[PDB]
């Protein structure tokens, strides 16, 4: 999830989808 994102910040508007799209793997 964005809250536990590993990448250098992804959610630029509180959007897990935009984040998990690459993260969580
Ligand atoms: Zn991320």
Curated annotation (Swiss-Prot):
Zn(2+) 1 binds at residue 5. It comes from the Eukaryota. Zn(2+) 2 binds at residues 19, 23. Methylation of the KIX domain by CARM1 blocks association with CREB. This results in the blockade of CREB signaling, and in activation of apoptotic response. Sumoylation negatively regulates transcriptional activity via the recruitment of DAAX. It is found in: Cytoplasm; Nucleus. The KIX domain mediates binding to HIV-1 Tat. It is linked to Chromosomal aberrations involving CREBBP may be a cause of acute myeloid leukemias. Translocation t(8;16)(p11;p13) with KAT6A; translocation t(11;16)(q23;p13.3) with KMT2A/MLL1; translocation t(10;16)(q22;p13) with KAT6B. KAT6A-CREBBP may induce leukemia by inhibiting RUNX1-mediated transcription. Rubinstein-Taybi syndrome 1: A disorder characterized by craniofacial abnormalities, postnatal growth deficiency, broad thumbs, broad big toes, intellectual disability and a propensity for development of malignancies. Acetylates histones, giving a specific tag for transcriptional activation. Mediates acetylation of histone H3 at 'Lys-18' and 'Lys-27' (H3K18ac and H3K27ac, respectively). Also acetylates non-histone proteins, like DDX21, FBL, IRF2, MAFG, NCOA3, POLR1E/PAF53 and FOXO1. Binds specifically to phosphorylated CREB and enhances its transcriptional activity toward cAMP-responsive genes. Acts as a coactivator of ALX1. Acts as a circadian transcriptional coactivator which enhances the activity of the circadian transcriptional activators: NPAS2-BMAL1 and CLOCK-BMAL1 heterodimers. Found in a complex containing NCOA2; NCOA3; IKKA; IKKB and IKBKG. Probably part of a complex with HIF1A and EP300. Interacts with GATA1; the interaction results in acetylation and enhancement of transcriptional activity of GATA1. Interacts with MAF and ZCCHC12. Interacts with DAXX; the interaction is dependent on CBP sumoylation and results in suppression of the transcriptional activity via recruitment of HDAC2 to DAXX. Interacts with phosphorylated CREB1. Interacts with CITED4 (C-terminal region). Interacts (via the TAZ-type 1 domain) with HIF1A. (Microbial infection) Interacts with HTLV-1 Tax, p30II and HBZ. This is CREB-binding protein. It comes from Homo sapiens. The chain holds residues 376 to 400 of 2442 of the full protein.
């Amino acid at each position: 999830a964005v809250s536990a994102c590993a990448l250098p910040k992804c959610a630029a508007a509180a959007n897990v989808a935009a984040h998990m799209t690459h993260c969580a793997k």
